[PDB]
């Protein structure tokens, strides 16, 4: 992350309008449909064997919301993503063994989720800022 002042405000301007729970449900729900092996990590949630069951599952909505709230939190400490994300890094790396490639797929689902819900606001420039941030969050999660 650099993140210039113009980038940070492209990000915050949009974030002020975002519905954390809808985007997070959309993002996590697409990760599991599109990249099916990620289901393995969430079998405690129940049936994930179809798009319809994924999009309807209450634990997916609720977990997607939780994931987005912590992304949201990261956005208020743009200067220290590693410090902010260090406990989640440990959890994901050491307890759960999630290959880092998957962090980047979720960051990408989150970009798609914001383009799908904010058609008019998600301009090439606004997307550019969000790619760095999602890339930063992925790198900070992969740090341990």
């Amino acid at each position: 992350v650099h993140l210039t002042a113009a980038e940070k405000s492209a990000i915050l301007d949009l974030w002020g309008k975002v519905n954390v729970g809808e985007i997070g449900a959309e993002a996590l729900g697409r990760l599991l449909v599109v990249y099916p092996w990620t289901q393995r990590f969430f079998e405690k949630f129940g049936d994930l064997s179809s798009a319809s069951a994924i999009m309807s599952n209450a634990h997916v909505k609720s977990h997607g919301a939780k994931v987005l709230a912590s992304f949201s939190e990261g956005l208020k400490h743009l200067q220290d993503l590693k410090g902010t994300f260090a406990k989640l890094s440990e959890l994901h790396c050491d307890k759960l063994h999630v290959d880092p490639e998957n962090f980047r797929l979720l960051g990408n689902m989150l970009t798609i989720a914001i383009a799908h819900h904010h058609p008019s606001e998600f301009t090439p420039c606004t997307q550019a800022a969000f790619q760095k941030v999602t890339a930063g969050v992925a790198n900070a999660l992969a740090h341990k």
């Binding site: 449909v33 599109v34 798009a51 970009t111 383009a115 799908h116 998600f122 090439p124 997307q127």
Partner: protein, 139 residues
């Protein structure tokens, strides 16, 4: 590997997009150039600034080749033979650039297609674009 369901989702979405495809692809190119500036390197010889006519013109060539891929889902290596030449022998394009472009394409479709861009439509298109990528980076 596309299933039979994936193929129908790809054909159905491509036919609905219809005459807009070249528009959507130019916007994909503009998104790739702006979110991954490193990809501009390959396009030093044209005007890559946002609404340029070089971009519309190139958007159209790319749309057309993707239309051809949609018409030959069961044997892409043969339909895309010539494009493999260009991308893997002549330009030697790093495959990381195809991930960038694919993602910018899905981003654009998610924005324009609204409710028709379902999680299943999305999954099928992603496998389609990865499959076109594997061929274009080929030999």
């Amino acid at each position: 590997v596309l299933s039979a369901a994936d193929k129908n989702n790809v054909k159905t979405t491509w036919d609905k997009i219809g005459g807009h495809a070249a528009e959507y692809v130019a916007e994909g190119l503009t998104r790739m150039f702006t979110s991954f500036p490193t990809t501009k390197t390959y396009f030093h010889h044209i005007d890559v600034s946002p609404g340029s006519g070089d971009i519309k013109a190139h958007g159209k060539k790319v749309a057309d080749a993707l239309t051809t891929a949609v018409g030959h889902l069961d044997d892409l290596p043969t339909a895309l033979s010539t494009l493999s030449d260009v991308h893997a022998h002549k330009l030697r394009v790093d495959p990381v650039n195809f991930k960038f472009l694919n993602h910018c394409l899905l981003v654009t479709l998610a924005a324009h297609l609204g409710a028709d861009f379902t999680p299943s439509i999305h999954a099928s298109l992603d496998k389609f674009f990865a499959s076109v990528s594997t061929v274009l980076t080929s030999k």
